[PDB]
Design a protein around this nucleic acid. Structure first.
Ligand SMILES: [Mg+2]
Ligand SMILES: [Mg+2]
Ligand SMILES: [Mg+2]
Ligand SMILES: [Mg+2]
Ligand SMILES: [Mg+2]
Ligand SMILES: [Mg+2]
Ligand SMILES: [Mg+2]
Ligand SMILES: [Mg+2]
Ligand SMILES: [Mg+2]
Ligand SMILES: [Mg+2]
Ligand SMILES: [Mg+2]
Ligand SMILES: [Mg+2]
Ligand SMILES: [Mg+2]
Ligand SMILES: [Mg+2]
Ligand SMILES: [Mg+2]
Ligand SMILES: [Mg+2]
Ligand SMILES: [Mg+2]
Ligand SMILES: [Mg+2]
Ligand SMILES: [Mg+2]
Ligand SMILES: [Mg+2]
Lengths: 151, 52, 23, 110, 95, 288, 162, 110
RNA sequence: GAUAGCUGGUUGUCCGAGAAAGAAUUUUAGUUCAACCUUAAAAAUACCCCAAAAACCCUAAAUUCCAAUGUAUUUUUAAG
RNA sequence: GGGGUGACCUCGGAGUACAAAAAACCCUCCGAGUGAUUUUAAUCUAGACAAACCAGUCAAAAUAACCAUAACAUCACUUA
């Protein structure tokens, strides 16, 4: 009931009720990205280093909250982390808190979605680790260039 | 043949000086040093004189 | 389970050129 | 100190658990602390001597010592070194076994 | 060291050690290398890095500093954004 | 059970004539008397050590001492002006709530914590209140209206996931002493003073919505809560639809110290009365 | 024969294509004892060796023990020991041809593992031994402040009782 | 009187690790004023002619032929001045690595 | 009750273990560290140590590091 | 090898000190209190030498710029 010159009501006259800080502005964000209810989240606490691995599995083909080109780009690029049952799986082991581990998994998913959604991706590759593969491919095509019909 | 101690400042704009020994009978010193602020090879010119 | 699913996590590569090719 | 509130599920989220309603038939009773915790602490001496102290024991403390040695023998492969203060009602095991002894006393219902 | 003061009868502490030393709660004392600001043009980059690096004290010097400091400097301090808060404790010390 | 009580029957009466301390509780003092402990009495031969004139501690026999050869560097420079915050883990808070020391049905404050013996605040040691850490954020299942001075993002998120309210307020040393020990202050005979504002070093921390500052704009609180929820992957509960929403949303005035009381009131605990000022200058000074 | 790639036994090898009783040069006319199987090296452990060995024989060797079925997708049945094979067929067979090549993992090994072998693709990694640190001292004399970080279990603040 | 400055401590120039000692990476094998022991396999060379281990293993000491750098003029001149059957031999210190480079562990069976 | 790194003196019994000096110092009549030693406490390797190994013009007695073996000692922690 | 006079006081090399290390004398001899030149020679960090302490020494991996193959500045007994 007490009031002063520095009270919140006298400091910010735009918001005077006590319930303005407890509203749920669903209109601000209507996209509703990452529907966590549709994700399979598992925690494995390995102790003895002590760390809680978080594993986020979700069916990529059944993921309808992303566009079809985005899903195709995911299935093309991140096929190394896609289960044989089609379930894309992300894993985090950095922090000991499952909260931070799940946050890291969600951030990885956000980066993947953004990289597959932006069309300005130039697909830049490194050089220190790719020069060897390039030389090996050239030296193997130097032998593959034989032209003789068979089969 | 007495030497001289001169403090040379970078020419890449960032404040970074280093001291070096030089000959007294020589002209104003100007070298190419490494500036860790810009991480490049920057020209360093003789700015001040500290010790004889 | 699947009889082919045995993995024996300690995989031994007796190829003397393996690490040399892997740099 | 207020008595702990009754919860619908045990153990509580903080890992606390009250004793059993009846008393066990063991010839000894490890009375809870004034904060309703198990009186199993750890002690350090000379900077390198690590001991575990079980306090607030009422009854045949030799039976508790025997049970503690029978419980700690398979973990170390040998009988652990123990001291029994009978006039105080205190057991002192050589080593850090506080968590294991707490879990053991919880299973025993103390 | 004044073991018994004249006003309060308490034990005093020397201020030089608190001016040029830092005590971690685990008993370790942290200090700077002597000469890390003297004639930097005459020294090699490796020697300059060795001088700039912090260093610990051994058992005798640590006990000496504990004798010269009071109990106010051996307390647990919870500072806001303390860089040495991660070093205030000791882990995996199998003695 | 206590067979010693039955053994005491055959033993004679316990009196002041048969009383012995514990063996080893009293190390006997030894005096410089006899053939062994005499004859220089543990001091040695001539010099300064037998005559009791050896130099002070840091002295090394004229050599420049170790405690003076090391260069001065700022390690404790301004240590008596660094704000200290006693840490309180969510694990310890859950332990207190589960053991019944603090009640989640009421707004939890520093006074409630010190009453429940969860934290000990030494304001003379530059302590500035309690900070919240996240050491037990995984198993925190309590819905409380917590009031701390500093909080971490993980702790705030762990409290919001259960559906509580976190708020970081400021207390100058005098108000902190009063809030920690209110009864010793009520027995003092002084009116409740005003709560001083945080300095410029802490104003950006307490006027920020991400820190849930008590001086922050209440319009930005739901946005920050939604950001924390979408970052940590938990659904933000409808706090306004709770039966204890009044207790969850109860607040303190930035000039107020206690709940329900006001600056300028005198609590007469002998007669159970509250003397309130009526003077216009008194009221203006106490409400400024 | 695939020398590296057997997941269970280290001292054993895999069969990929065994065809005996070749009349002269016509390899297709000879009966294939083991149907052809594509190389399936794991993703982590790379650069396996695959060797074609050609043996010349005198008699018409007939065997029912070394025969493989027509699908032949069982890794337990596709386990070879060239030493024992040559010990069994040492009287007639004599090795005269050899051609070995290296092979690493590509995007078809997942297909070979899933469709043909009916398995999950095993992924390995080249881990390194942990770095050596001396016994931690009580008073590390003249050591840098980062001495205490070499023996840290995790870079997370742990508040014991607070 | 006339002879001054002859007082100087020994620089402790010697061999730290002997043959058979299990050393770690960075362990100084031997310090020297002049080139007495030459580095061989997995043994580095500091600018003060000191020898340190680059790998973790067992130290060995061998006698091996000496082929100098074609730029070191003094050594090349001595080489070309040697007779037709002469071969320079030196004492080399090696480190035979014991631990393997790494192992292949199964991280995920997807 | 000045101060003395200087001299002198320093009061019961018995038992256990038990030290001859490297470095600084207006320091060599003294102190402070190290190495020894005492009292407790944690551990595990401790001495003896055959091969093999330790430089180039000549170089003795012998050293360093090491298995086995014969013994039980040694290292850290806290007070000194 | 009493003090006084004379000489010395810090650092490095060789012998004493023959082969791991250390090792004194008002012991026998050399020297240093810097010059010349350009490759102007970084950050961070495992692990080690040496050492009472203070100080002194090396150094793998990783990082920014130059060959896309070196960077320890070099020489003056290089040690001072
Ligand atoms: Mg204790
Ligand atoms: Mg005494
Ligand atoms: Mg006395
Ligand atoms: Mg005596
Ligand atoms: Mg006498
Ligand atoms: Mg005497
Ligand atoms: Mg004397
Ligand atoms: Mg006397
Ligand atoms: Mg002096
Ligand atoms: Mg406190
Ligand atoms: Mg000499
Ligand atoms: Mg000397
Ligand atoms: Mg006197
Ligand atoms: Mg004296
Ligand atoms: Mg021998
Ligand atoms: Mg031995
Ligand atoms: Mg004489
Ligand atoms: Mg004179
Ligand atoms: Mg040493
Ligand atoms: Mg490098």
């Amino acid at each position: 009931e007490f009031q002063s010159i520095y009270s919140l009501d006298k400091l910010y006259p735009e918001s005077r009720g006590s319930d303005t800080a407890w509203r749920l502005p669903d209109d601000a964000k209507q996209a509703n990205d990452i529907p966590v209810d549709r994700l399979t989240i598992s925690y494995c606490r390995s102790s003895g280093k002590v760390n809680s691995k978080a594993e986020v599995r979700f069916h990529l083909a059944s993921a309808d909250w992303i566009a079809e080109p985005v899903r195709l780009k995911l299935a093309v690029k991140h096929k190394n982390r896609i289960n044989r049952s089609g379930e894309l799986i992300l894993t985090s082991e950095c922090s000991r808190y499952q909260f931070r581990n799940l946050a890291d998994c969600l951030q990885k998913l956000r980066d993947m979605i953004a990289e597959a959604s932006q069309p300005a991706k130039e697909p830049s590759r490194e050089d220190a680790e790719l020069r060897r593969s390039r030389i090996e491919n050239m030296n193997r095509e130097r032998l593959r260039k034989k032209r003789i019909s068979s089969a | 043949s007495k030497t001289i101690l001169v403090k040379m400042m970078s020419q890449a704009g960032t404040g970074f000086s280093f001291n070096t020994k030089r000959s007294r009978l020589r002209e104003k010193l100007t070298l190419l040093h490494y500036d860790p602020v810009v991480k490049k090879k920057v020209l360093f010119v003789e700015q001040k004189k500290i010790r004889s | 389970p699947v009889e082919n699913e045995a993995v024996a996590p300690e995989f031994t590569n007796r190829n003397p050129r393996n690490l040399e090719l892997l740099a | 100190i207020p008595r702990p509130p009754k919860h619908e599920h045990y153990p509580t989220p903080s890992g606390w658990q009250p004793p059993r309603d009846p008393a066990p038939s063991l010839p000894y009773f490890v009375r809870r602390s004034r904060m309703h915790n198990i009186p199993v602490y750890r002690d350090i001496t000379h900077g390198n001597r690590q001991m575990t102290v079980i306090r607030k024991v009422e009854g045949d403390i030799w039976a508790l010592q025997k049970d503690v040695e029978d419980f700690l023998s398979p973990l170390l492969g040998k009988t652990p070194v123990t001291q029994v203060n009978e006039v105080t009602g205190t057991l002192r095991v050589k080593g850090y076994f506080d968590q294991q002894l707490k879990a053991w006393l919880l299973e025993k219902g103390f | 060291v004044t073991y018994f003061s004249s006003r309060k009868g308490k034990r005093k502490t020397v201020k030089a050690v608190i001016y040029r030393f830092l005590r971690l709660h685990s008993g370790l004392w942290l200090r700077r290398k002597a000469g890390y600001k003297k004639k930097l043009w005459k020294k090699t980059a490796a020697r300059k890095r060795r001088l700039r690096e912090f260093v610990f004290c051994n058992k005798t010097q640590s006990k000496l500093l504990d004798k010269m400091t009071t109990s106010f400097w051996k307390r647990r301090n919870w500072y806001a954004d303390d860089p040495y808060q991660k070093y205030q404790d000791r882990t995996n010390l199998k003695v | 059970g206590p067979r010693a009580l039955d053994l005491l029957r055959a033993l004679p009466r316990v009196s002041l004539a048969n009383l012995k301390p514990n063996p080893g509780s009293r190390k006997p003092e030894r005096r410089p008397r006899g053939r062994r402990r005499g004859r220089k009495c543990g001091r040695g031969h001539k010099g300064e050590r037998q005559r009791g004139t050896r130099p002070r501690l840091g002295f090394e026999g004229g050599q420049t001492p170790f405690y003076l050869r090391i260069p001065k560097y700022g390690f404790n420079e301004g240590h008596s002006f660094r704000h200290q915050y006693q840490p309180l883990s969510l694990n310890r808070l859950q332990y207190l709530i589960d053991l019944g020391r603090v009640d989640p049905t009421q707004p939890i404050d520093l006074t409630q914590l010190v009453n429940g013996r969860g934290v000990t605040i030494q304001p003379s040691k530059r302590d500035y209140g309690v900070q919240l850490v996240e050491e037990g954020a995984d198993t925190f299942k309590a819905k409380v209206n917590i009031e701390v001075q500093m909080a971490s993002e993980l702790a705030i998120a762990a409290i919001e996931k259960n559906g509580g309210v976190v708020t970081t307020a400021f207390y100058d040393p005098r108000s902190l002493e009063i809030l920690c020990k209110p009864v010793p202050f009520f027995l003092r005979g002084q009116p409740i003073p005003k709560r001083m504002l945080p300095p410029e070093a802490l104003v950006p921390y307490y006027t920020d919505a991400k820190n849930r500052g008590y001086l922050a704009d209440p319009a930005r609180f739901p946005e920050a809560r939604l950001e924390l929820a979408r970052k940590y992957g938990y659904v933000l509960p409808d706090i306004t639809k709770d039966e204890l929403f009044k207790m969850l949303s109860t607040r303190k005035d930035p000039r107020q110290i206690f709940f329900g009381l006001a600056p300028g009131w005198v609590v007469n605990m002998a007669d159970k009365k509250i003397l309130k000022p009526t003077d216009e200058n008194l009221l203006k000074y106490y409400s400024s | 024969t695939n020398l590296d790639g057997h997941l269970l036994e280290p001292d054993a090898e895999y069969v990929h294509w065994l065809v005996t009783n070749i009349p002269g040069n016509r390899v297709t006319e000879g009966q294939e004892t083991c149907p052809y199987l594509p190389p399936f090296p794991a993703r982590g452990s790379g650069f396996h060796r695959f060797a074609f060995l050609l043996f010349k024989q005198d008699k018409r060797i007939d065997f029912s023990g070394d025969t493989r079925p027509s699908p032949c997708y069982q890794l337990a049945q596709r386990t070879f020991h060239t030493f024992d094979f040559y010990k069994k067929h040492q009287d007639a067979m004599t090795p005269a041809g050899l051609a070995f090549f290296q092979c690493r993992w590509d995007d078809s090994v997942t297909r070979v593992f899933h469709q043909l072998l009916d398995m999950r693709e095993p992924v390995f990694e080249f881990v390194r031994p942990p770095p050596y640190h001396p016994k931690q001292k009580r008073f590390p004399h003249r050591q840098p402040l980062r001495y205490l970080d070499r023996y840290r279990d995790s870079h997370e603040p742990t508040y014991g009782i607070y | 009187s006339k002879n001054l400055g002859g007082k100087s401590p020994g620089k402790r120039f010697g061999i730290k690790k002997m043959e058979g000692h299990y050393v770690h990476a960075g362990n100084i094998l031997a310090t020297q004023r002049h080139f007495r022991w030459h580095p061989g396999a997995h043994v580095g060379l500091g600018k003060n002619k000191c020898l340190y281990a680059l790998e973790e293993g067992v130290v060995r000491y061998t006698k091996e032929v000496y082929v100098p750098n074609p730029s070191n003029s003094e050594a090349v001149d001595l080489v070309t001045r040697l007779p037709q059957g002469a071969v320079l031999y030196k004492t080399f210190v090696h480190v035979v690595p014991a631990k393997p480079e790494g192992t292949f562990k199964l991280v995920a069976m997807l």
